[PDB]
């Protein structure tokens, strides 16, 4: 029942992964009810079988160096074909930092919050009677830069993957839409000699109009995520309130106002604690006592 | 088991999200059993393959500047193509304020109701024997404007998204239905020279009759939601009964008649409490005692 | 485990919502295995593509003022097209009064039955030893007309929605079946000039024979629900037995024979209690004692 | 864990509802893998579109007075079209008596068995030591004819619905199979004048051979259910054993040999008890003691 | 957790029902991916619509007396059409004896095993200290022939249904495979006069090769079940071990070596007990003590 | 939570059943997305209906003695048609030995392990204080050859079914692939006289290339299972460690080094115990004490 992952990172993950998977789920699975991703205008003399041959042949040709012409060269025709996989790549590359965290950090941390919470209850319970073990413990967790670097890198991975998506999508959107039309030819091999076949089949990639639309949506959303991810690095400013002061009002506590402007794991603990310790009655009581004080026998009247 | 979100906002959310998703689920997935979203009248000389080429080509052309003619210009043909996504956009933009609240506020609040309820039981239990901690606490929550602003903005986001849908739908409904017919042409590229192809293919977007119908339904419903959302802002009037007076009848309680006409979080607490404290036996008992009184040994005869 | 909603209203809801949703689920999803909702008789000279164009074009035309002819005018052709949605509208408009009740009343009431039951056990438990708090409480709930008006209106909403369905269905059934045939034309725009196209395509809406059949079934069932809903308003007669007399036989109880012929919430409580208090052993015991009596030491021999 | 509904009625319901729903589930959903429910022999000059038009037109015509000819008149062609719904009607009309009972009687009865069982344990527990409250109670339940009439009517409803199905199915089976062929015509409206169209299209309803087969199966099964339902009314003979005599052997019990040949609810209680009291250890013990006796200190050696 | 149904009968049921349902599930649902159950060789002059008409017409004709010719007469063509239902009939007729037992016997028996087990623990627990109630009870269950007759008949029903399947399948397999070809004709009604139609259409029922194969598999398996079902009737020999002797070694038990060669319910109890009493520690202990003995203070050293 | 079936036999079963079911699930359900299992080259003069007739006719002909020619004779064409069922047969015949064991042995054994474990805890618990009932019990289970023969036969059944699959698959793989082509003819009956029909239709069974591939995979895997199953019979060598010696170090235990080289059930118990007794703390303790000893007051320091 602990809040083992920050809502910001849950939100960023839920967006950054949820969005592209949704977008793929939309443009393909339903609107492919329209049927076909490519079509090519055969001669009328072609049997229906031969026309179906042209379409399926040219669908393969789009990635093959000689079988094509466009002013763009072949390059963008790859993107139109592979477009959903390229989104799926970004989706996967954003899920892994969370799955990494879900194993590299979560079972490493869950122990410590439970420990610290009970220690905070000791501090409170000892106050009720009116060694600094957890203080000395946390004072030592000041001297660590292990788990913060897992976090920084987890964010940094997520940051880079997002930023590359923005550049890639901008290119894919900047791509001149009329490049969705191209000239195929099937005059390979035996058919090379067939005079009954035209030298080119004009073709159109049908879904390109959807993908360029989807790209702008996904581009703008990721452009919004960028400053949010940037804000994640403002860790010393992300420490909102020195809630340890609420305990420091007790004689059973100490001046752990350790808003470390150095990259110290203790500061990262402060963030997760500032999230989770909202659960503690003792915190509520002491915050209440603090807020009302804004005499310890008062605790007996609780 | 707490009533952590107001039924009004649950209703508004359940409607505002449930409606468009339902509407999409209707007009497409079942009635696309009719098969096709577009058709175009080829010449009879076209092979079936060539006719299928025309339909699928023109389906792409609808968003491409030169390949079209209509008195509207191309603009509305975008809307007819993208119509379900535009609804889905509004659906998503209305779900997020609740998902935001479900994380930004719900775990921030659930603590406080549980705390206040137990304090109210203390007030009652101490009365049964016949410091003002929770009173001083709540008297201090008067001096906050944090969580109310999360609420106001959550409503305000929901308000704007709804209002834009109403304008957009009104435009989409005001759109002259006969604009669903347009002239396509495939005489691009190689086919530019083909004398066997007509200069235009007449086409019709089949589903437009459904969407304009659906738009009026969704428009009227959202026009109903508008005054409800407006009512959500009448917070000082939304505080229906000063139930704190029922406790104030006790000597163990105080004149917390804090119907704040300023935008104070305490007033927002009053709303959620006025919802949730219906659960308390103590409230029932004291309301009963109050209602009957409409002597404290009476509590011993309960 | 409380009987929080009256079986009559559960039955009425289960019918009034369950029926049309079933009817829709029948006539479409399975029998659309027959394939098509419309067909039109092209000339034989039409390619299969062109014939498919006619069908899909005329399917759109049915709601467009000029593209049609029938002696009915266009109006009923709307109904044939939109028929399932019109049923779905009635289904939704009947579900909401229950969903309203499920939130506006159910969590408002569940408290009170639990309270009253325990009070009735006190009355019985105090009898076993052989202030009138709950009596004075219920005597005060006489002086309320809040929750009864939620109930009356919930029924009244349900009543009106049902009655409008009956009129609408009667019209849709009275509709002359042969109006399912109509004359379409595609000679719009470019095709306006095409001499190869006939001036009319005769068309038939295939499913109309099913819908008129379904309409009679649904009409008759709703005509049965009408007098049942009317009976729901006979609340003072719906109070079947003054079970409070069974407690009034105790000296620990009072003459709460409050069959209010005024619209008083207490009478509505009597209905839900007369439902739920069947659960109470004390009720059983006292009913047994009453029925056998048809001496209090007897309770010691229970 | 009570046996709240008689196995006979569970069996009858499970058959009477389970059978037709199974039959529908068979003949349609799988064998419609054969594709089509109707076909009509067009001229060879018809395009495939025109032939598909004939089939779908005549599928509608089967219920329309003038568009048909058969020696039967139109009537049986309705039945062939609507056949699954007519079965579904019977299925629904047999489920409702159980759903009625599941609400009108089950929560009205479950209280009483639990009460009587505990009273029987008192009778036994008081015997172990070696007022007649439950006896006087049950002696009074003699004087009721409420719940028996719910039961009789629930059976009687089920009886009538079954019997009408048998007559209806007999008619539908007696229907001369060759009436599945009929002459359609499409020469309505504009096509009225078309010399290229034949005056009749011969048609065949494909599935009729299945339905007449299914009808005989369902007919014979329901003909078996009839005498079973009749047996349900032999209630005074359905009381198999006066198990109350097993308690009457105790001095803590009385001569409740109340095999009422009048229609008295007590007799209906006897049936459900004779079902459920098989659960009681006390019954087992007393039946064992009775069966062995076929001295009360014996109960101490149990 | 009781072994309320014999593994033999569970096995026989699991086979006898599981096999045909599996066989149906195989030959149809997957291999109907081949598409069609019938085809007929039209003239080449037939339109595709007309050819599809022939196939679907003749599919109906197979059960109609005049529309056919085969040396077998029409009879076997029924079987080929109805084949899956005939298997499904046998499947259902074998499930019902278990469903019957699951209600007519299982809740009638579950009481008694639980009772007898506790009595056996009393016998053992009283031995540990080192009236014959259960002995006299079981000695009386000797004098019953009720539940054994439910069992015998349940087996006998299962036996007959199996045996009829074997004869039926043998006939269906003995059916000369080439009877899957037959001559249809469509020259009924109007088409009676059509000179363009051939007097016969040759047709083949495609799946017949699968069904005759499946029939041999199912035939051989049921031929194996026959002697197993026969063995079920050897009840006095099916009583494998007089485990009651293991208790009879105790002075707290009696010579209940009641291997009844008469059809007495006690013998049927012996079977279910000989199954279930393997659960008892007391049985294990006494079997262990017996097996080791192959002195009662020994029980204190357990 | 007992290890009631040996991991070897679970592995062998999981492979031997899991493999063929997987193989079937692969080659058919997905790659039948290629559509057809057979095709035959009609003349070009055939209508599409007539060509479809040829394919479906010849699909039936493959098992019919005269309608075919191949150098193999008809025999292998059966196998190609029935191939998935033949695999499914082997799958079923390997599942049954486990399902047999799951009922014939598992509830017969589960009792005994639980018993023996508690006895081993007695031996240990009595050692902690520092009759041979379980020893004498197990010494008697030496004199049994019942359950071992269920095991041997269960393995032996599994062995034979596997070995027959290997021979069968070797034949099916050795089958010359070009036998997938054969000459059909439809000139039966009426068509016997049709000069427009060719005397042969050449046909190819499309999937044969997959099945011969799959056969080699399945062949090699089963060839691996053979020596594993053989190893299962080395039971006296499969008894890995005389763990009873670890208890025999106690004075509360005996020299039960009963590595029976005769086929005695006790040896089979040793295997399941050597599996399951890894769970016992006592075993761990005594193994630890043994391993450290590699003084009984030591057990008090545990």
Swiss-Prot record, chains A, B, C, D, E, F:
GO MF annotation: an example: protease binding
Query: Can you state which reaction this protein catalyses?
Result: chloride(in) = chloride(out); iodide(out) = iodide(in); Ca(2+)(in) = Ca(2+)(out); ATP(in) = ATP(out)
Major localisation: membrane
Report the superkingdom from the record.
Eukaryota
Compartment(s): Cell membrane; Endoplasmic reticulum membrane
| Sequence positions bearing S-nitrosocysteine | 14, 285
Where does the UniProt entry place glycosylation sites? 193
Q: How does it sit in the membrane?
A: Multi-pass membrane protein
Keywords from UniProt, A to Z, are: Calcium, Calcium channel, Calcium transport, Cell membrane, Disulfide bond, Endoplasmic reticulum, Glycoprotein, Ion channel, Ion transport, Membrane, Phosphoprotein, S-nitrosylation, Transmembrane, Transmembrane helix, Transport
Q: Where are the transmembrane segments?
A: 15-35, 81-101, 156-176, 217-237
Where is it made, tissue-wise? Widely expressed, including in cartilage, skin, spleen and brain.
Give all cystine bridges in this chain.
40-203, 58-184
What task does this protein carry out?
Ion channel involved in a variety of physiological functions such as blood pressure regulation, apoptotic cell clearance and oogenesis. Forms anion-selective channels with relatively low conductance and an order of permeabilities: nitrate>iodide>chlroride>>aspartate=glutamate=gluconate. Can release ATP upon activation through phosphorylation or cleavage at C-terminus. May play a role as a Ca(2+)-leak channel to regulate ER Ca(2+) homeostasis.
Q: What is this protein called?
A: Pannexin-1
Protein species of origin? Mus musculus (Mouse)
């Amino acid at each position: 029942g602990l809040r083992l992952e920050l809502a910001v990172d849950k939100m960023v993950t839920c967006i950054a992964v949820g969005l592209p998977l949704l977008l793929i789920s939309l443009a393909f699975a339903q609107e492919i009810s329209i049927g076909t991703q490519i079509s090519c205008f055969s001669p009328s003399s072609f049997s229906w079988a031969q026309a179906a041959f042209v379409d399926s042949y040219c669908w393969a040709a789009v990635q093959q160096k000689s079988s094509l012409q466009s002013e763009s060269g072949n390059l963008p025709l790859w993107l139109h074909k592979f477009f959903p996989y390229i989104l799926l790549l970004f989706a996967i590359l954003l899920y892994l930092p969370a799955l990494f965290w879900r194993f590299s950090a979560a079972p490493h941390l869950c122990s410590d919050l439970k420990f610290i919470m009970e220690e905070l209850d000791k501090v409170y319970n000892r106050a009720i009677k009116a060694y600094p073990i957890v203080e000395q413990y946390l004072k030592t967790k000041k001297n660590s830069s292990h788990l913060i670097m897992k976090y920084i890198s987890c964010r940094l991975v997520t940051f880079v993957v997002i930023l590359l998506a923005c550049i890639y999508l901008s290119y894919y959107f900047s791509l001149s839409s009329l490049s969705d039309e191209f000239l195929c030819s099937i005059k390979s091999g035996v058919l090379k000699n067939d005079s009954t076949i035209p030298d080119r089949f004009q073709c159109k990639l049908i879904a390109v109009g959807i993908f360029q639309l989807l790209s702008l949506i996904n581009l703008i959303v990721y452009a919004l995520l960028i400053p949010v991810v940037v804000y994640t690095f403002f860790i010393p400013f992300r420490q909102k309130t020195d809630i340890l002061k609420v305990y420091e009002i007790l004689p059973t506590f100490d001046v752990l106002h350790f808003k470390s402007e150095g990259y110290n794991d203790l500061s990262l603990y402060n963030l997760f604690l500032e999230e989770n310790i909202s659960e503690l009655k003792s915190y509520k009581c002491l915050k209440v006592l603090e807020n009302i004080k804004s005499p310890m026998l008062l605790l007996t009247n609780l």
